[PDB]
């Protein structure tokens with residue numbers, strides 16, 4: 001299976017200055033649970049933003065940099081390389097990767113951040129005419145998670 005994982009706000013903002021615009025621990029937990037034991041494919045900028053490979057999953061980084069060789073990370077240099085990766089593959093970001101892969105993925109696990117943030121990077125537009133809502137679950141709010149959010153699982157019709 002080839003899936004997208006993304007958190008985007010009401011206007012599809014996904015990032016600002018190479019970081020998440022919001023602090024939402026529950027989104028990170030959501031992503032951890034979905035991807036543990038599986039594969040993440042991310043662009044070079046997203047990788048450098050996180051700063052280290054995430055434990056207990058395969059970390060694959062897409063970059064044109066032939067000097068890229070980081071411990072605990074596998075490197076690919078083409079979009080086509082993604083299709084040769086076994087198991088459940090998750091497209092992990094960022095904007096460029098999402099734009100390249102939205103037409104290619106089986107499904108999407110979206111965290112809709114129910115707010116309007118300042119962004120410099122965006123998830124591409126999509127329509128529910130193309131995507132079936134497999135599930136929609138309202139995120140629980142507490143002291144550490146104060147922004148309303150909804151976990152959507154969308155499957156291409």
Ligand SMILES: NC(=O)c1ccc[n+]([C@@H]2O[C@H](COP(=O)([O-])OP(=O)(O)OC[C@H]3O[C@@H](n4cnc5c(N)ncnc54)[C@H](OP(=O)(O)O)[C@@H]3O)[C@@H](O)[C@H]2O)c1
Nearest residue numbers: 006007014015018019043044045046063064093094095096
């Ligand atoms: N909200 C979310 O779910 C989420 C998740 C992840 C990231 N983000 C955000 O997204 C933003 C980053 O997005 P971005 O588009 O600027 O960067 P990005 O997608 O993370 O990485 C872009 C880089 O990936 C490499 N790349 C992409 N396609 C390639 C291809 N076909 N062949 C070879 N290399 C390729 C290139 O690396 P080289 O220049 O090294 O060649 C390119 O510069 C940040 O703000 C981050 O916080 C948000």
Ligand SMILES: COc1cc2nc(-c3nccs3)n(-c3ccc4c(N)nc(N)nc4c3)c2cc1OC
Nearest residue numbers: 005006007018019020028031032049050092093111
């Ligand atoms: C150390 O723990 C984490 C740190 C993280 N930093 C990030 C950053 N995102 C953008 C810039 S940095 N995340 C990420 C990375 C990708 C995500 C995606 N595709 N989708 C969703 N929903 N959340 C993400 C969180 C992270 C996810 C993490 O745990 C899973």
